[PDB]
Design an enzyme around this catalytic site. Structure first.
Site, PDB file in Angstrom:
ATOM      1  N   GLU A   1      38.045  36.750  37.151  1.00 23.87           N
ATOM      2  CA  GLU A   1      37.056  37.605  36.515  1.00 23.87           C
ATOM      3  C   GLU A   1      36.026  36.842  35.712  1.00 23.87           C
ATOM      4  OE1 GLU A   1      38.804  41.382  37.737  1.00 23.87           O
ATOM      5  OE2 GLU A   1      36.832  40.733  37.047  1.00 23.87           O
TER       6      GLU A   1
ATOM      7  N   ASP B   1      29.103  44.373  36.938  1.00 23.62           N
ATOM      8  CA  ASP B   1      30.128  43.745  37.774  1.00 23.62           C
ATOM      9  C   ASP B   1      29.652  43.771  39.228  1.00 23.62           C
ATOM     10  OD1 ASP B   1      32.709  46.362  38.179  1.00 23.62           O
ATOM     11  OD2 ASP B   1      30.599  46.354  38.725  1.00 23.62           O
TER      12      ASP B   1
ATOM     13  N   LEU C   1      35.815  46.906  32.235  1.00 21.76           N
ATOM     14  CA  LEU C   1      34.841  47.904  32.599  1.00 21.76           C
ATOM     15  C   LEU C   1      34.495  48.807  31.422  1.00 21.76           C
ATOM     16  CD1 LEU C   1      33.229  49.201  34.862  1.00 21.76           C
ATOM     17  CD2 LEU C   1      35.127  50.815  35.186  1.00 21.76           C
TER      18      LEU C   1
ATOM     19  N   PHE D   1      44.534  45.667  38.291  1.00 18.11           N
ATOM     20  CA  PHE D   1      43.535  45.363  37.266  1.00 18.11           C
ATOM     21  C   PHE D   1      42.148  45.564  37.852  1.00 18.11           C
ATOM     22  CE2 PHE D   1      42.621  43.107  33.249  1.00 18.11           C
ATOM     23  CZ  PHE D   1      41.317  42.690  33.432  1.00 18.11           C
TER      24      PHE D   1
ATOM     25  N   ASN E   1      47.188  43.397  57.179  1.00 15.14           N
ATOM     26  CA  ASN E   1      46.823  44.767  56.841  1.00 15.14           C
ATOM     27  C   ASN E   1      45.927  44.806  55.611  1.00 15.14           C
ATOM     28  OD1 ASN E   1      47.633  47.649  55.445  1.00 15.14           O
ATOM     29  ND2 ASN E   1      47.731  47.694  57.661  1.00 15.14           N
TER      30      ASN E   1
END
Ligand SMILES: *SCC1=CC(C)(C)N(O)C1(C)C
Length: 164
Positions: A11, A20, A32, A104, A132
């Site tokens: 991050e 972001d 956020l 997260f 997947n």
């Protein structure tokens, strides 16, 4: 390495409000603020989260406090979620960190939408899970971070974060 160092790498750290990868107002270590297009609404949320008149700038210790709260909340969010907890309980410590990273980034609801992949993880079919997991908007939108997380689920090691 551990979940805190992992997410700090994924991050980054910024002390002023920024947008972001999705364009949403954010600060610190991926915290956020709001999905609202309004910078003022974001400033309002910020002051509310920090408990002072910030004028959109925070210190490094304020950033790490929000980060500690957010990791804590992600962990407890997994443990109270009926789809997620059984998967988390079945994993080893390194792979648990990868699941926390996903929550997260995209939230519980978001991760619970990876139902087929989670079943594969629970069965410990790591290669098949990794395939997947890559068939997803997540992977197409943030491929470099998604590759690191996926590699962590496939190998059960920190090698993707090695020398970073
Ligand atoms: S996403 C819901 C879910 C399906 C199944 C693979 C049976 N699970 O173990 C959980 C609850 C993750």
């Amino acid at each position: 390495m551990n979940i805190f160092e992992m997410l700090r790498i994924d991050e980054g750290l910024r002390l002023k409000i920024y947008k972001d990868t999705e364009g949403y107002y954010t600060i610190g270590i991926g915290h956020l603020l709001t999905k609202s297009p309004s910078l003022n609404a974001a400033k309002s949320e910020l002051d509310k989260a920090i408990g002072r008149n910030t004028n959109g700038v925070i210190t490094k210790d304020e950033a790490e406090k929000l980060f500690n709260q957010d990791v804590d909340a992600a962990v407890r969010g997994i443990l109270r979620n009926a789809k997620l907890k059984p998967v988390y309980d079945s994993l080893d410590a390194v792979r648990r960190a990868a699941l926390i990273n996903m929550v997260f980034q995209m939230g519980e609801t978001g991760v619970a939408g990876f139902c087929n992949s989670l079943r594969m993880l629970q069965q410990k079919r790591w290669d098949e899970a990794a395939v997947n997991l890559a068939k997803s908007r997540w992977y197409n939108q943030t491929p470099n971070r998604a590759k690191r997380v996926i590699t962590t689920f496939r190998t059960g090691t920190w090698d993707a974060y090695k020398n970073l």
